[PDB]
Amino acid sequence: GAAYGFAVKLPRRNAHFNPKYKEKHKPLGSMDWKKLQRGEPNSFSERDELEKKRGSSELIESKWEDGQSRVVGYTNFTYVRSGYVYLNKNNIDIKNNIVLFGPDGYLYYKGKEPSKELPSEKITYKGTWDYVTDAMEKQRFEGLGSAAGGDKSGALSALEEGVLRNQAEASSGHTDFGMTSEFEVDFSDKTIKGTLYRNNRITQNNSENKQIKTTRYTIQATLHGNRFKGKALAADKGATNGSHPFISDSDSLEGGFYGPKGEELAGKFLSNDNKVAAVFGAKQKDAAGPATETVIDAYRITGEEFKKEQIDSFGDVKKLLVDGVELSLLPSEGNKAAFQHEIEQNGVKATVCCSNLDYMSFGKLSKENKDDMFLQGVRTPVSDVAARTEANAKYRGTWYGYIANGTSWSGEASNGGNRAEFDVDFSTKKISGTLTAKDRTSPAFTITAMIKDNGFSGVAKTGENGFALDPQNTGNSHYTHIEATVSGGFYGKNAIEMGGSFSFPGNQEKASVVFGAKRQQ
Ligand SMILES: [Cs+]
Ligand SMILES: [Cs+]
Ligand SMILES: [Cs+]
Ligand SMILES: [Cs+]
Secondary structure (H helix, E strand, O other): OOOOEEEEEOOOOEOOOOOOOOOOEEOOOHHHEEEEOOOOOOOOHHHHHHHHHHOOOOOEEOOOOOOOOOEOOOOOOOOEEEEEEEEOOOEEEOOOOEEEOOOEEEEEEEEOOEOOEEEOOEEEEEEEEEEEEOEEOOOOOOOOOHHHOOOOOOOOHHHOOOEOOOOOOOOOOOOEOOOEEEEEEEOOOOEEEEEEOOEEOOOOOOOOOOOOEOOOEEEEEEEOOOEEEEEEEEOOOOOOOOOOOOOOOEEEEEEEEEOOOOOEEEEEEEOOOOOEEEEEEEEOOOOOOOOEEEOEEEEEEOOOOOOEEEOOOOOOOOEEEOOOOEEEOOOOOOOOOOOEEEEEOOOOEEEEEOOOOOOEEEEEEEOOOOOEEEEEEEEOOOHHHHHOOOOOOOEEEEEEEEEEOOOOEEEOOOOOOOEEEEEEOOOOOEEEEEEEOOOOOOOOEEEEEEEEOOEEEEEEEOOOOOEEOOOOOOOOOOEEOOEEEEEEEEEOOOOOEEEEEEEEOOOOOEEEEEEEEEEOO
Protein backbone atom coordinates (compact mmCIF):
# COMPACT_ATOMS: atom_id res chain seq x y z
CA GLY A 1 0.00 0.00 0.00
CA ALA A 2 3.08 2.22 0.05
CA ALA A 3 3.79 4.10 -3.18
CA TYR A 4 6.53 6.14 -4.86
CA GLY A 5 6.42 9.14 -2.56
CA PHE A 6 4.23 11.30 -0.35
CA ALA A 7 3.65 14.98 0.39
CA VAL A 8 1.83 16.84 3.16
CA LYS A 9 0.84 20.47 2.64
CA LEU A 10 2.54 22.81 5.12
CA PRO A 11 -0.25 23.89 7.53
CA ARG A 12 -1.32 27.54 7.57
CA ARG A 13 -4.40 28.28 9.68
CA ASN A 14 -6.65 31.13 8.56
CA ALA A 15 -5.44 33.63 11.16
CA HIS A 16 -8.05 36.23 10.28
CA PHE A 17 -9.71 38.83 12.45
CA ASN A 18 -12.86 37.17 13.71
CA PRO A 19 -16.30 37.43 12.17
CA LYS A 20 -16.21 33.61 12.45
CA TYR A 21 -13.73 33.49 9.56
CA LYS A 22 -10.78 32.95 11.90
CA GLU A 23 -9.48 29.38 11.82
CA LYS A 24 -8.96 28.07 15.35
CA HIS A 25 -6.76 25.12 14.41
CA LYS A 26 -5.22 23.65 11.26
CA PRO A 27 -4.41 20.07 12.36
CA LEU A 28 -2.71 17.19 10.57
CA GLY A 29 -4.07 13.79 9.59
CA SER A 30 -3.34 10.63 7.61
CA MET A 31 -5.79 11.85 4.97
CA ASP A 32 -3.78 15.06 4.61
CA TRP A 33 -0.97 13.03 3.08
CA LYS A 34 -1.16 12.98 -0.71
CA LYS A 35 0.42 10.38 -2.98
CA LEU A 36 3.13 11.03 -5.57
CA GLN A 37 3.33 9.23 -8.92
CA ARG A 38 6.21 8.25 -11.21
CA GLY A 39 8.79 10.72 -12.49
CA GLU A 40 11.83 12.53 -11.11
CA PRO A 41 12.19 12.80 -7.29
CA ASN A 42 12.79 16.56 -7.44
CA SER A 43 9.50 17.26 -9.23
CA PHE A 44 5.79 16.42 -8.94
CA SER A 45 2.26 17.80 -9.36
CA GLU A 46 1.91 20.12 -6.37
CA ARG A 47 5.53 21.25 -6.73
CA ASP A 48 4.92 22.18 -10.37
CA GLU A 49 1.87 24.06 -9.11
CA LEU A 50 4.28 25.85 -6.80
CA GLU A 51 6.59 26.59 -9.72
CA LYS A 52 3.70 28.09 -11.68
CA LYS A 53 2.53 30.04 -8.62
CA ARG A 54 6.11 31.22 -8.19
CA GLY A 55 6.39 34.05 -10.64
CA SER A 56 8.96 36.83 -10.33
CA SER A 57 11.41 34.90 -8.14
CA GLU A 58 12.33 33.00 -4.98
CA LEU A 59 11.79 29.24 -4.77
CA ILE A 60 12.93 27.47 -1.62
CA GLU A 61 13.71 23.80 -2.02
CA SER A 62 15.50 21.56 0.46
CA LYS A 63 18.17 20.05 -1.76
CA TRP A 64 21.39 19.94 -0.17
CA GLU A 65 22.21 22.76 0.02
CA ASP A 66 24.89 23.44 0.65
CA GLY A 67 23.72 25.94 3.18
CA GLN A 68 21.56 24.01 5.65
CA SER A 69 20.64 20.44 6.71
CA ARG A 70 23.21 18.01 5.21
CA VAL A 71 25.62 15.19 6.10
CA VAL A 72 28.99 15.52 4.34
CA GLY A 73 30.16 12.30 2.69
CA TYR A 74 26.62 11.05 2.24
CA THR A 75 26.32 13.83 -0.30
CA ASN A 76 24.48 13.53 -3.61
CA PHE A 77 21.18 11.67 -3.91
CA THR A 78 20.31 10.51 -7.43
CA TYR A 79 17.28 8.31 -6.75
CA VAL A 80 15.77 10.07 -3.73
CA ARG A 81 14.71 13.56 -2.67
CA SER A 82 13.16 14.15 0.74
CA GLY A 83 12.56 17.42 2.56
CA TYR A 84 10.71 20.71 2.24
CA VAL A 85 9.62 22.80 -0.74
CA TYR A 86 7.84 26.09 -0.08
CA LEU A 87 7.38 29.74 -1.00
CA ASN A 88 7.21 32.99 0.98
CA LYS A 89 3.90 33.95 -0.63
CA ASN A 90 1.27 34.85 1.96
CA ASN A 91 -2.40 34.64 0.99
CA ILE A 92 -4.55 37.74 1.43
CA ASP A 93 -8.23 37.99 0.55
CA ILE A 94 -9.66 41.27 1.82
CA LYS A 95 -11.92 40.66 -1.16
CA ASN A 96 -13.29 37.99 1.20
CA ASN A 97 -12.40 35.75 2.74
CA ILE A 98 -8.90 34.44 3.53
CA VAL A 99 -5.79 35.32 5.56
CA LEU A 100 -2.83 32.91 5.44
CA PHE A 101 0.65 33.64 6.81
CA GLY A 102 3.74 31.44 6.61
CA PRO A 103 5.45 29.06 4.14
CA ASP A 104 3.18 28.08 1.24
CA GLY A 105 4.52 24.65 0.34
CA TYR A 106 4.81 20.94 1.04
CA LEU A 107 6.84 18.49 3.12
CA TYR A 108 7.57 15.57 0.82
CA TYR A 109 9.69 12.54 0.05
CA LYS A 110 10.01 10.90 -3.37
CA GLY A 111 12.11 8.20 -5.00
CA LYS A 112 12.57 6.68 -8.45
CA GLU A 113 13.46 3.15 -9.57
CA PRO A 114 12.11 1.13 -6.60
CA SER A 115 14.68 -1.47 -5.56
CA LYS A 116 14.27 -5.00 -6.88
CA GLU A 117 17.71 -5.82 -5.48
CA LEU A 118 18.90 -5.39 -1.89
CA PRO A 119 22.13 -6.14 0.05
CA SER A 120 22.49 -9.39 1.99
CA GLU A 121 24.34 -8.00 5.02
CA LYS A 122 24.32 -5.15 7.55
CA ILE A 123 24.42 -1.76 5.82
CA THR A 124 24.31 1.71 7.40
CA TYR A 125 22.55 4.65 5.73
CA LYS A 126 23.06 8.26 6.79
CA GLY A 127 20.98 11.23 5.68
CA THR A 128 18.51 13.87 6.87
CA TRP A 129 14.96 14.34 8.13
CA ASP A 130 12.47 17.21 8.34
CA TYR A 131 9.31 17.87 10.34
CA VAL A 132 6.26 20.13 10.45
CA THR A 133 3.48 20.64 12.98
CA ASP A 134 -0.13 21.82 13.00
CA ALA A 135 -1.28 25.43 13.22
CA MET A 136 -2.91 26.12 16.58
CA GLU A 137 -3.76 29.61 17.85
CA LYS A 138 -1.23 30.94 20.38
CA GLN A 139 0.96 27.84 20.14
CA ARG A 140 4.72 28.31 20.44
CA PHE A 141 7.67 26.03 21.17
CA GLU A 142 10.38 27.98 23.01
CA GLY A 143 12.88 25.18 22.41
CA LEU A 144 12.39 25.44 18.66
CA GLY A 145 12.19 29.23 18.41
CA SER A 146 9.50 31.82 17.73
CA ALA A 147 10.77 32.27 14.17
CA ALA A 148 9.38 28.80 13.55
CA GLY A 149 5.80 30.01 14.09
CA GLY A 150 3.39 27.24 14.98
CA ASP A 151 0.80 29.91 15.33
CA LYS A 152 -0.37 30.85 11.82
CA SER A 153 2.36 28.58 10.44
CA GLY A 154 3.11 25.03 11.56
CA ALA A 155 6.62 24.98 13.07
CA LEU A 156 8.80 24.10 10.08
CA SER A 157 12.09 22.25 10.59
CA ALA A 158 13.73 24.60 8.09
CA LEU A 159 13.19 27.45 10.54
CA GLU A 160 14.31 25.79 13.78
CA GLU A 161 16.44 28.41 15.50
CA GLY A 162 19.16 26.73 17.56
CA VAL A 163 20.51 24.30 14.97
CA LEU A 164 23.82 24.16 13.10
CA ARG A 165 23.71 24.81 9.35
CA ASN A 166 26.29 27.24 7.95
CA GLN A 167 29.44 25.02 7.83
CA ALA A 168 31.60 28.05 8.67
CA GLU A 169 31.47 26.62 12.19
CA ALA A 170 34.27 24.04 12.41
CA SER A 171 35.90 24.60 9.02
CA SER A 172 37.30 21.06 9.24
CA GLY A 173 35.51 17.93 8.06
CA HIS A 174 32.55 18.45 10.38
CA THR A 175 30.08 15.91 9.11
CA ASP A 176 26.56 16.24 10.38
CA PHE A 177 24.33 19.29 9.85
CA GLY A 178 20.88 20.40 10.94
CA MET A 179 18.42 17.58 11.49
CA THR A 180 20.32 14.44 10.52
CA SER A 181 19.15 10.84 10.35
CA GLU A 182 21.09 7.63 11.00
CA PHE A 183 20.07 4.08 10.10
CA GLU A 184 21.41 0.55 10.44
CA VAL A 185 19.75 -2.13 8.34
CA ASP A 186 20.07 -5.88 8.79
CA PHE A 187 18.64 -7.26 5.55
CA SER A 188 19.30 -10.83 6.66
CA ASP A 189 17.14 -10.09 9.70
CA LYS A 190 14.68 -7.93 7.74
CA THR A 191 15.11 -5.25 10.40
CA ILE A 192 15.79 -1.50 10.45
CA LYS A 193 17.05 0.50 13.41
CA GLY A 194 17.26 4.28 13.26
CA THR A 195 17.75 7.57 15.09
CA LEU A 196 16.59 11.07 14.16
CA TYR A 197 19.02 13.61 15.62
CA ARG A 198 19.22 17.39 15.96
CA ASN A 199 22.62 19.05 15.50
CA ASN A 200 22.95 21.96 17.93
CA ARG A 201 24.90 25.15 17.34
CA ILE A 202 26.70 25.33 20.66
CA THR A 203 26.27 28.98 21.55
CA GLN A 204 29.39 31.18 21.33
CA ASN A 205 29.77 31.00 25.11
CA ASN A 206 27.18 28.26 25.47
CA SER A 207 24.56 30.26 27.27
CA GLU A 208 21.54 28.48 28.48
CA ASN A 209 21.22 24.82 27.80
CA LYS A 210 22.58 22.44 25.58
CA GLN A 211 25.06 19.91 24.24
CA ILE A 212 26.08 18.67 20.77
CA LYS A 213 23.16 16.54 19.51
CA THR A 214 19.53 16.24 20.61
CA THR A 215 18.06 12.79 19.97
CA ARG A 216 14.66 13.73 18.54
CA TYR A 217 13.54 10.22 17.62
CA THR A 218 14.38 6.56 17.20
CA ILE A 219 12.99 4.27 14.52
CA GLN A 220 12.08 0.58 14.51
CA ALA A 221 10.93 -1.10 11.30
CA THR A 222 10.77 -4.35 9.32
CA LEU A 223 10.93 -5.27 5.62
CA HIS A 224 8.38 -7.01 3.43
CA GLY A 225 9.27 -6.35 -0.18
CA ASN A 226 11.41 -3.29 -0.88
CA ARG A 227 9.49 -1.20 1.63
CA PHE A 228 9.71 -0.94 5.42
CA LYS A 229 6.90 -0.57 7.95
CA GLY A 230 7.07 0.23 11.65
CA LYS A 231 7.08 2.64 14.57
CA ALA A 232 8.83 5.88 15.45
CA LEU A 233 9.68 6.28 19.14
CA ALA A 234 9.83 9.78 20.62
CA ALA A 235 12.77 10.26 22.98
CA ASP A 236 10.78 12.65 25.17
CA LYS A 237 7.60 10.66 25.74
CA GLY A 238 7.55 12.18 29.21
CA ALA A 239 7.00 15.80 28.20
CA THR A 240 4.66 18.51 29.49
CA ASN A 241 6.96 21.54 29.41
CA GLY A 242 5.63 22.42 25.97
CA SER A 243 9.14 23.15 24.73
CA HIS A 244 8.79 20.85 21.71
CA PRO A 245 6.00 18.85 19.97
CA PHE A 246 8.04 15.64 20.04
CA ILE A 247 6.01 14.12 22.87
CA SER A 248 4.13 11.32 21.11
CA ASP A 249 5.27 8.27 19.14
CA SER A 250 4.12 7.14 15.70
CA ASP A 251 2.69 3.75 14.73
CA SER A 252 2.43 5.05 11.17
CA LEU A 253 6.03 4.84 9.96
CA GLU A 254 6.31 3.83 6.30
CA GLY A 255 9.22 3.86 3.88
CA GLY A 256 11.09 2.24 1.01
CA PHE A 257 14.40 1.62 -0.73
CA TYR A 258 15.41 3.21 -4.04
CA GLY A 259 18.12 2.57 -6.61
CA PRO A 260 18.83 -0.67 -8.52
CA LYS A 261 21.08 -2.04 -5.76
CA GLY A 262 19.01 -0.24 -3.14
CA GLU A 263 21.71 2.34 -2.49
CA GLU A 264 19.17 4.80 -1.08
CA LEU A 265 16.09 4.89 1.16
CA ALA A 266 13.35 7.30 2.25
CA GLY A 267 10.17 7.45 4.31
CA LYS A 268 7.63 9.29 6.44
CA PHE A 269 5.72 9.11 9.71
CA LEU A 270 2.94 10.96 11.52
CA SER A 271 2.94 11.24 15.32
CA ASN A 272 0.11 9.51 17.20
CA ASP A 273 -1.14 12.81 18.62
CA ASN A 274 -1.33 14.17 15.06
CA LYS A 275 1.04 16.96 16.09
CA VAL A 276 4.13 16.20 14.01
CA ALA A 277 4.41 15.01 10.41
CA ALA A 278 7.94 14.10 9.35
CA VAL A 279 9.86 12.80 6.34
CA PHE A 280 13.40 11.45 5.96
CA GLY A 281 15.94 10.36 3.35
CA ALA A 282 19.28 8.59 3.66
CA LYS A 283 21.97 7.05 1.44
CA GLN A 284 25.34 5.33 1.74
CA LYS A 285 28.82 6.88 1.58
CA ASP A 286 30.58 8.12 -1.58
CA ALA A 287 34.18 0.48 -7.33
CA ALA A 288 31.83 -0.18 -4.41
CA GLY A 289 31.35 -3.74 -3.19
CA PRO A 290 28.19 -4.33 -1.16
CA ALA A 291 27.18 -8.00 -1.43
CA THR A 292 23.65 -7.98 -2.83
CA GLU A 293 20.81 -10.19 -4.09
CA THR A 294 17.51 -9.93 -5.97
CA VAL A 295 14.31 -9.85 -3.90
CA ILE A 296 11.66 -8.83 -6.43
CA ASP A 297 11.01 -9.92 -10.01
CA ALA A 298 8.75 -7.78 -12.19
CA TYR A 299 8.89 -7.68 -15.97
CA ARG A 300 6.75 -7.53 -19.09
CA ILE A 301 7.42 -9.53 -22.23
CA THR A 302 6.97 -7.04 -25.07
CA GLY A 303 4.64 -8.02 -27.91
CA GLU A 304 6.56 -9.00 -29.65
CA GLU A 305 9.92 -7.39 -30.40
CA PHE A 306 12.42 -9.55 -28.50
CA LYS A 307 13.37 -9.27 -24.84
CA LYS A 308 11.69 -8.29 -21.58
CA GLU A 309 11.13 -4.78 -20.25
CA GLN A 310 11.64 -4.34 -16.52
CA ILE A 311 8.75 -2.68 -14.69
CA ASP A 312 8.56 -0.99 -11.29
CA SER A 313 7.39 -2.98 -8.27
CA PHE A 314 6.77 -2.39 -4.56
CA GLY A 315 6.37 -6.04 -3.61
CA ASP A 316 2.61 -5.83 -4.03
CA VAL A 317 1.66 -8.76 -6.26
CA LYS A 318 -2.02 -7.80 -6.22
CA LYS A 319 -1.35 -4.81 -8.51
CA LEU A 320 1.08 -3.70 -11.22
CA LEU A 321 2.56 -0.56 -12.78
CA VAL A 322 2.71 0.23 -16.50
CA ASP A 323 5.46 2.81 -16.10
CA GLY A 324 2.68 5.38 -15.55
CA VAL A 325 -0.35 4.50 -13.44
CA GLU A 326 -1.48 1.80 -10.99
CA LEU A 327 -3.42 -1.28 -12.11
CA SER A 328 -5.43 -3.25 -9.54
CA LEU A 329 -5.48 -7.00 -10.15
CA LEU A 330 -8.28 -7.86 -7.72
CA PRO A 331 -11.88 -8.70 -8.71
CA SER A 332 -14.52 -6.23 -7.52
CA GLU A 333 -18.30 -6.58 -8.03
CA GLY A 334 -17.50 -9.38 -10.50
CA ASN A 335 -17.09 -11.93 -7.71
CA LYS A 336 -13.90 -13.77 -6.74
CA ALA A 337 -12.20 -15.90 -7.71
CA ALA A 338 -12.33 -18.99 -9.94
CA PHE A 339 -8.80 -19.46 -11.26
CA GLN A 340 -8.00 -16.71 -13.75
CA HIS A 341 -9.67 -13.29 -13.69
CA GLU A 342 -9.27 -10.48 -16.22
CA ILE A 343 -9.87 -6.79 -15.54
CA GLU A 344 -9.93 -3.43 -17.30
CA GLN A 345 -9.36 -0.13 -15.50
CA ASN A 346 -9.73 2.78 -17.95
CA GLY A 347 -6.17 3.09 -19.26
CA VAL A 348 -5.47 -0.51 -20.26
CA LYS A 349 -6.93 -4.02 -20.07
CA ALA A 350 -5.27 -7.18 -18.73
CA THR A 351 -5.69 -10.80 -17.66
CA VAL A 352 -3.96 -12.14 -14.55
CA CYS A 353 -3.37 -15.61 -13.09
CA CYS A 354 -4.03 -17.01 -10.68
CA SER A 355 -5.78 -18.04 -7.46
CA ASN A 356 -3.43 -20.78 -6.23
CA LEU A 357 -0.55 -18.29 -6.13
CA ASP A 358 -0.19 -15.62 -3.44
CA TYR A 359 3.44 -14.55 -3.82
CA MET A 360 3.35 -14.16 -7.61
CA SER A 361 1.09 -13.13 -10.48
CA PHE A 362 1.57 -13.62 -14.21
CA GLY A 363 -0.52 -13.11 -17.33
CA LYS A 364 -1.12 -10.83 -20.29
CA LEU A 365 -1.88 -7.14 -20.86
CA SER A 366 -3.16 -5.06 -23.77
CA LYS A 367 -3.25 -1.42 -24.87
CA GLU A 368 -1.56 -1.06 -28.26
CA ASN A 369 -3.55 -4.08 -29.46
CA LYS A 370 -0.26 -5.98 -29.32
CA ASP A 371 -0.52 -7.99 -26.10
CA ASP A 372 2.46 -8.25 -23.77
CA MET A 373 3.01 -10.85 -21.03
CA PHE A 374 3.76 -9.70 -17.49
CA LEU A 375 5.24 -11.73 -14.64
CA GLN A 376 5.87 -10.39 -11.15
CA GLY A 377 6.52 -11.80 -7.69
CA VAL A 378 8.40 -11.40 -4.43
CA ARG A 379 11.20 -13.97 -4.40
CA THR A 380 12.15 -16.32 -1.57
CA PRO A 381 15.61 -15.05 -0.54
CA VAL A 382 18.12 -16.51 -0.11
CA SER A 383 19.85 -18.64 2.50
CA ASP A 384 16.52 -20.37 3.06
CA VAL A 385 16.67 -21.78 -0.48
CA ALA A 386 20.39 -22.53 -0.14
CA ALA A 387 19.98 -24.37 3.18
CA ARG A 388 17.10 -26.39 1.81
CA THR A 389 18.17 -29.98 1.26
CA GLU A 390 15.25 -32.14 0.14
CA ALA A 391 15.21 -34.78 -2.60
CA ASN A 392 12.25 -34.01 -4.87
CA ALA A 393 9.91 -31.02 -4.68
CA LYS A 394 7.42 -31.65 -7.50
CA TYR A 395 5.98 -28.20 -8.24
CA ARG A 396 2.71 -27.99 -10.17
CA GLY A 397 1.17 -25.06 -12.02
CA THR A 398 0.51 -23.63 -15.47
CA TRP A 399 1.50 -21.10 -18.12
CA TYR A 400 0.55 -18.48 -20.70
CA GLY A 401 2.12 -19.01 -24.11
CA TYR A 402 2.35 -17.60 -27.63
CA ILE A 403 4.02 -19.18 -30.66
CA ALA A 404 4.04 -17.65 -34.15
CA ASN A 405 5.76 -17.88 -37.52
CA GLY A 406 3.26 -17.21 -38.82
CA THR A 407 0.85 -18.90 -38.38
CA SER A 408 0.16 -17.81 -34.85
CA TRP A 409 -1.24 -19.62 -31.81
CA SER A 410 -1.71 -18.71 -28.15
CA GLY A 411 -2.54 -20.63 -24.98
CA GLU A 412 -3.88 -19.60 -21.58
CA ALA A 413 -3.63 -21.05 -18.06
CA SER A 414 -5.95 -23.90 -17.09
CA ASN A 415 -7.29 -25.40 -13.87
CA GLY A 416 -6.48 -31.68 -19.22
CA GLY A 417 -5.73 -28.15 -20.36
CA ASN A 418 -2.47 -26.21 -20.09
CA ARG A 419 -0.34 -27.58 -17.25
CA ALA A 420 3.22 -27.49 -15.91
CA GLU A 421 5.06 -30.04 -13.76
CA PHE A 422 8.45 -29.21 -12.22
CA ASP A 423 10.90 -31.49 -10.41
CA VAL A 424 13.37 -29.75 -8.10
CA ASP A 425 16.27 -31.67 -6.57
CA PHE A 426 18.12 -29.55 -4.01
CA SER A 427 21.71 -30.18 -2.81
CA THR A 428 22.54 -30.95 -6.45
CA LYS A 429 20.59 -27.87 -7.57
CA LYS A 430 19.44 -29.80 -10.66
CA ILE A 431 15.87 -29.11 -11.75
CA SER A 432 13.81 -30.52 -14.61
CA GLY A 433 10.25 -30.03 -15.79
CA THR A 434 7.67 -30.05 -18.57
CA LEU A 435 4.81 -27.78 -19.58
CA THR A 436 1.99 -29.17 -21.72
CA ALA A 437 -0.59 -27.63 -24.05
CA LYS A 438 -4.37 -28.02 -24.31
CA ASP A 439 -5.76 -31.52 -24.94
CA ARG A 440 -2.41 -32.59 -26.40
CA THR A 441 -0.71 -35.90 -25.59
CA SER A 442 3.02 -35.15 -25.66
CA PRO A 443 4.70 -32.33 -23.67
CA ALA A 444 4.87 -28.97 -25.46
CA PHE A 445 7.99 -27.59 -23.77
CA THR A 446 10.68 -29.48 -21.87
CA ILE A 447 12.63 -27.32 -19.43
CA THR A 448 15.99 -28.31 -17.97
CA ALA A 449 17.59 -25.91 -15.51
CA MET A 450 19.71 -25.44 -12.39
CA ILE A 451 19.43 -23.35 -9.22
CA LYS A 452 21.59 -20.36 -8.33
CA ASP A 453 20.96 -17.92 -5.47
CA ASN A 454 17.20 -17.48 -5.09
CA GLY A 455 16.47 -18.34 -8.71
CA PHE A 456 16.91 -20.86 -11.50
CA SER A 457 18.29 -20.65 -15.03
CA GLY A 458 18.14 -23.11 -17.91
CA VAL A 459 16.89 -23.99 -21.37
CA ALA A 460 13.47 -24.89 -22.77
CA LYS A 461 13.11 -26.89 -25.98
CA THR A 462 10.22 -28.41 -27.91
CA GLY A 463 9.79 -32.08 -28.80
CA GLU A 464 12.23 -33.92 -31.05
CA ASN A 465 9.75 -33.88 -33.93
CA GLY A 466 8.79 -30.29 -33.15
CA PHE A 467 5.61 -28.51 -32.06
CA ALA A 468 2.84 -28.49 -34.67
CA LEU A 469 0.98 -25.18 -34.76
CA ASP A 470 -1.65 -26.93 -36.86
CA PRO A 471 -1.76 -30.58 -35.74
CA GLN A 472 -4.88 -31.12 -37.85
CA ASN A 473 -4.69 -30.15 -41.53
CA THR A 474 -1.43 -31.92 -42.29
CA GLY A 475 -0.20 -29.83 -45.22
CA ASN A 476 1.88 -27.12 -43.58
CA SER A 477 1.19 -28.25 -40.02
CA HIS A 478 3.95 -25.74 -39.26
CA TYR A 479 6.08 -27.93 -37.02
CA THR A 480 7.84 -24.95 -35.46
CA HIS A 481 10.49 -26.19 -33.04
CA ILE A 482 11.92 -23.76 -30.50
CA GLU A 483 14.95 -23.93 -28.22
CA ALA A 484 15.37 -20.90 -25.96
CA THR A 485 16.95 -19.71 -22.72
CA VAL A 486 14.44 -19.81 -19.86
CA SER A 487 14.98 -17.82 -16.66
CA GLY A 488 12.97 -17.95 -13.45
CA GLY A 489 12.83 -17.46 -9.70
CA PHE A 490 11.54 -18.96 -6.46
CA TYR A 491 8.66 -16.99 -4.94
CA GLY A 492 7.08 -17.54 -1.53
CA LYS A 493 7.89 -17.95 2.16
CA ASN A 494 9.46 -21.40 1.99
CA ALA A 495 9.87 -21.26 -1.79
CA ILE A 496 6.41 -22.80 -2.05
CA GLU A 497 5.99 -21.24 -5.49
CA MET A 498 8.17 -20.73 -8.55
CA GLY A 499 7.86 -18.73 -11.76
CA GLY A 500 9.68 -17.85 -14.95
CA SER A 501 9.72 -17.01 -18.65
CA PHE A 502 11.40 -17.39 -22.04
CA SER A 503 11.11 -15.54 -25.35
CA PHE A 504 12.65 -15.89 -28.81
CA PRO A 505 12.99 -13.64 -31.91
CA GLY A 506 14.72 -14.43 -35.20
CA ASN A 507 16.20 -12.80 -38.31
CA GLN A 508 11.30 -15.70 -38.85
CA GLU A 509 9.50 -17.63 -36.14
CA LYS A 510 8.82 -15.97 -32.82
CA ALA A 511 7.67 -16.89 -29.40
CA SER A 512 7.03 -15.89 -25.78
CA VAL A 513 6.03 -17.93 -22.71
CA VAL A 514 5.50 -17.14 -19.01
CA PHE A 515 4.79 -19.69 -16.27
CA GLY A 516 4.06 -20.21 -12.57
CA ALA A 517 3.80 -23.28 -10.32
CA LYS A 518 3.27 -24.27 -6.68
CA ARG A 519 5.31 -26.60 -4.45
CA GLN A 520 3.22 -29.45 -3.04
CA GLN A 521 5.17 -32.70 -2.57
CS1 LIG B 1 14.50 21.66 23.02
CS1 LIG C 1 3.86 32.39 13.43
CS1 LIG D 1 19.94 31.41 14.48
CS1 LIG E 1 1.61 7.86 22.18
